Amino acid sequence: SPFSVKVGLAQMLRGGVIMDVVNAEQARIAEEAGACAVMALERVPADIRAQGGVARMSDPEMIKEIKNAVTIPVMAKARIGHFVEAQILEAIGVDYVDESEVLTLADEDNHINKHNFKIPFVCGCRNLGEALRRIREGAAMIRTRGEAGTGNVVEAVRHVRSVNGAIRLLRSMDDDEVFTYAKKIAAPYDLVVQTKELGRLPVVQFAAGGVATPADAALMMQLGCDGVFVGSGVFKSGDPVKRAKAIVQAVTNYRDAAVLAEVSCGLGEAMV
Amino acid sequence: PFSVKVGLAQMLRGGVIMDVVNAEQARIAEEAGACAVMALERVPADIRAQGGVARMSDPEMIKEIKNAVTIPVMAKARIGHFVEAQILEAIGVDYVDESEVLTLADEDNHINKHNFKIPFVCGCRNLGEALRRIREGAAMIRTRGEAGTGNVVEAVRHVRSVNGAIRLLRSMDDDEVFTYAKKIAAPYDLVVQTKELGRLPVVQFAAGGVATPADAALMMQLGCDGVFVGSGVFKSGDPVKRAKAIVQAVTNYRDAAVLAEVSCGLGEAMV
Amino acid sequence: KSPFSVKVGLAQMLRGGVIMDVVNAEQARIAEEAGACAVMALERVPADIRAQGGVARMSDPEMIKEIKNAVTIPVMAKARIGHFVEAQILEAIGVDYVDESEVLTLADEDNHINKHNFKIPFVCGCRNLGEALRRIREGAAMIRTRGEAGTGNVVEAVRHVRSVNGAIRLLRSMDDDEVFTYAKKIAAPYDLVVQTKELGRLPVVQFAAGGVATPADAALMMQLGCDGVFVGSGVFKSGDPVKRAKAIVQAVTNYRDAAVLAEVSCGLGEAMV
Amino acid sequence: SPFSVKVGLAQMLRGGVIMDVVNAEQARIAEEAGACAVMALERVPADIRAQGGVARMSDPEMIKEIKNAVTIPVMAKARIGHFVEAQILEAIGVDYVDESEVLTLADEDNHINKHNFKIPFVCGCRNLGEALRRIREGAAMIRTRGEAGTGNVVEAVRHVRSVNGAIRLLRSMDDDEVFTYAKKIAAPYDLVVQTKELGRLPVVQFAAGGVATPADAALMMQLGCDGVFVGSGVFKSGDPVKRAKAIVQAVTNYRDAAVLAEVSCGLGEAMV
Amino acid sequence: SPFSVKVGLAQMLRGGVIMDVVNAEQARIAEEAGACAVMALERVPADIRAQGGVARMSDPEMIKEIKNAVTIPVMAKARIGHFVEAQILEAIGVDYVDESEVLTLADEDNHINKHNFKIPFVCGCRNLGEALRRIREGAAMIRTRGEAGTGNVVEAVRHVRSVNGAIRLLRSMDDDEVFTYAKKIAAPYDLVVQTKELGRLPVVQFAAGGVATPADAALMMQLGCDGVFVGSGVFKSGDPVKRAKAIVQAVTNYRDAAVLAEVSCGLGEAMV
Ligand SMILES: *C[C@H](N)C(=O)/C=C/OP(=O)(O)O
Ligand SMILES: *C[C@H](N)C(=O)/C=C/OP(=O)(O)O
Ligand SMILES: *C[C@H](N)C(=O)/C=C/OP(=O)(O)O
Ligand SMILES: *C[C@H](N)C(=O)/C=C/OP(=O)(O)O
Ligand SMILES: *C[C@H](N)C(=O)/C=C/OP(=O)(O)O
Known about the structure:
This is part of a larger assembly, with 5 copies of chain A. The first copy, chain A, has a single domain, classed as TIM Barrel. By secondary structure, the first copy, chain A, is an alpha/beta fold. Chain A is 44% helix and 15% strand. Chain A has an 8-stranded parallel β-barrel with strand order 1-2-3-4-5-6-7-8, surrounded by 8 helices. Chain A has 12 helices and 8 strands. Chains in contact: A-B, A-C, B-C, B-D, B-E, C-D, D-E. Chain B binds chain E through residues 149-153, 156-157, 160, 211-212, 214-215, 217-218, 221, 253, 256-257, 259-260, 263-266, 269, 271, and chain E through 53-54, 56-57, 59-61, 64, 81-85, 87-88, 90-92, 104-110. The site of one ligand KPR has 20 residues of chain D, from helix 3, strand 4 and strand 8. Chain C: Pfam families: SOR_SNZ (PF01680).
């Protein structure tokens, strides 16, 4: 099954950190720090927030440079609904497209039909219903997003707890009430049932938004994520190389408080 | 094990706990006679003035503060950020303050404090909040006003609310306590324990706005077991003298002659 | 060990049973012969209270002694919410359970009876889990998950059974760290919420009540996971109370046997208006 | 002081039941039942409610017939603010005037200045502030009223719990907060302080309103009242003679469940 | 009676001007100008308004200096509800504490229990009910305040007229309506009656707020005050020494238009 193949590709990222990079130098830093993949974008989310202006798919020249600089998978963001941007990214050989809300919405009413592509897609979500709608559209991996570019995990905690609490609610829910639940969260019933049977999201689920410290990243993992995205927390901090390695080690050893303490020690300024 | 942590906190009764952001402030607080220090990144008046996300202190700074003093060292963690508290426990702080002056990490849940071996401080504005924090595992309650304003008005409000509610509860008809516990959304058993003790089941300190010795003795005369001072000492003109004066005020809070003496010639209070 | 757990233990005997409202000894005797596990003595059945209005109070003790004398199964009696003196009287005349009931006229809008002060067990009503746990903390030994009394419409009982059980299933799989906030949100005592989480069920017997008019209704309550059903109006406001009472009892005894449900429903005559 | 003498007169009624009577026959029934006093009025509160129309002080003729019929004290109702009605009641020798809200309000803004009278007054209240305001006007006894003429104790339970909860609040209140409390309930501070010091109301406190059964009456006594008024529950019931004695016995033995059970047995129909 | 003694102390200030001083130089100026007392505070009210920031009891060192610099009585402000601040002021020997609204409220729900102190207190008020509540708390002198630090008498005129008009209303009020009046203004009935019997406030009443010119001060006196407070009008004006003497003479000769004209002539800039 072509979708299950795409899902399997994203499973290989479990336990990893994906780092936003806007040039090839940042891409090397992330790979050396132990990132499982990099995300090519025009500006990290904290700069998109402070500066404003329309944010689009990165120039294919920049993506090519980042692909050449690393051997780990390379993701790239496309505007929501901008399926031509995604066609271009697939054509130049990115490994994943992130149909991303940090870029400027291109279609306020529809997402990309991700089934028309060979490579897997990441989509964001704030709740289970959103996650399942993205998956029905063909998303092979889900980013449970908070607020990008603020260094504040509070919304990612909210959305991780919301998605996982809804899954747990679903696990023990009376079968006969699942139809109404699927109407209530506006999700395809088959995907709701698959989630109930698995007891987890049918695709990999990473946290994203405001992860600024190793404590934050391990928090996301102890809350039940398969990995984390860091967009601004590394490359807007005082010591990106050391913070990047620290966040990777936090995610690999997310239950080991002594390791979390050690990698957090003497880490310099987090992002503003 | 929870009563062990509740008992530990008893050793701070009668004391002043002082916020410190580095080892120099920590030694000043100990020499002034503070019963413990509270390590945080910025004093609350600076967090309020400057904005920005405020998190747990870097472990390196906490280790520095631990090595500078021999009185208990507390540290702040963001509400709900249980991994920050795991780290603070792993580096050997004596108390975690799950603190509202830091940027909220979980808007819906506090830390499950029963999963830790060290005692936790939590803030409250009323009795129901205090009892909820205690049921989560807090061993000590900070009855908080407004952090970083030098204005005790909200601390006075919340101390009178908590203690007024405890006094209400003490004379309350037993049959009305069930509805009372619903009304303040508190665990009934802890409500009953408060009624039977006649005081909060854990140590209760005032915090927020304590700027002068008179403020500090005011909190004690309103029936607190101690006071936090976050900004009043180190945002003031003479930190070393004000810290000793606030400590002496809390130790001698009913002695107007002493209160007048230690307040004399104290310099500028915090802005 | 504790006196409360002894009362809770005693109520277990009622699992699988039907408790029928009776207003005289004739009704009580019919209920016992139909196989009811207990009767509920009250002044008027809920449909009559609803239609007639007026203040509804504890039954006259003479009525209760007549009902106790007529049957050997347990006798329950209704007391107004908050009216602890009515309950003291019911206890002194030897009823087996007091139902602190919303079908009677509320006597204290702000407090329920302190049921821990009594030796005999109490039933209390609830619409949701928080209500149930607050009643249990006050000392209710058994919970009646109530819909609308006297209407013959199960729709609200279904709502409240699904609500209580939905919340229990929600609780069973809930992340432990979220239970403190959950206890606050439903305004329930935390220890009882945790106990409910651990057991996967209500810590006391849970019956459905309100609007159960047919055997299908009763068996529906049982298939939604109740331990038993109250029938107040559906039996004695119907056209054939004796046949209907046996049918509902059989429905609760054999609630998964559709052939039996079909059988006991056949020719049952008119249900309540 | 003259006021404390009046207050002492009403103390002699502790443990008693006061019954509303509209003629000498009812008054004799009440005295024989053991009532500590009777309350002369034109119509029992249940009739005033169902019938409407202006309700005033009883005709002095009817009051004289009631005084001739009994030797226990005779009370009579006067309209709120109607000090001339009270002057008349005093001139014909009633023992207490009840400035009563079950009669038609004569002055919407002022109560009778009860210090200008030699005999003691009863006033109603819903909360402690009302009681203390009535007492400052010269009320020697407070009746804590619910809904008169409905046979429903719910509002009297509310008001008894309100007054008593306020007094218990006041007993443990910080002395410095009492000034603001007296402002909040709009009550004379000296009477608030006196209530705090006594731990109870500075005058006798009876329950009234909706007491229909012996259980109701004993309920009021167990809630902390000194006695009960019964306006409608006796003479609108099926068996007033038996019910009046049962209520009296209930109030005398209000903590004895076996007695309460016994006197409640076979009591006939309560009021509608 | 200890309260009547405190009241008698404040009577000696009748016909006087109390001047705010923030150092010993201002205190001498006020005494030489003929002030009956000085008020030690950290900043005059016009500066507290313009600058903001929390305003507390003056440092006891400053109060000591002001006490040493003058022989007339020395008052000091404490924050409303800050009874420890008042304990300190009593301990260092001020003659009066002003529980003052120009300082930052410390207890939004309660004032200081002034009966626990040996020295008399001043409190502010905007209306009779406030004045009487402060007096019940133990205030021995009342400051009928307008708007401090604006130089605009309009609110002090409003509040002086309000207090005096309410007293005049009370003077001629039907006795039987006084109970309801005391509820309406939320004042202790005994104090309301005392005010009605005296025909004036039971303690000394000074005006305060916006008194900027000798005309203003004499206005307050012709409206019926026993004296005036000047906080900003002297020491924020162009010629404090001359304006201070002028305001004192205005208050001493408040009905003598020729004197008011003379002392107002050539007075330089009033406060901004
Ligand atoms: C969309 C991108 N992959 C991402 O995860 C952004 C995160 O925002 P930040 O809060 O800057 O980590
Ligand atoms: C949370 C911290 N320990 C604290 O007590 C803050 C006090 O606020 P401040 O107003 O700065 O004393
Ligand atoms: C309170 C009584 N036990 C009861 O269950 C009422 C049921 O209502 P109905 O709808 O009449 O069966
Ligand atoms: C005012 C009269 N004495 C009285 O107490 C009325 C009671 O009302 P009811 O509900 O008729 O007892
Ligand atoms: C509180 C002080 N005693 C005072 O009277 C303030 C007056 O204000 P101003 O308007 O500046 O005279």
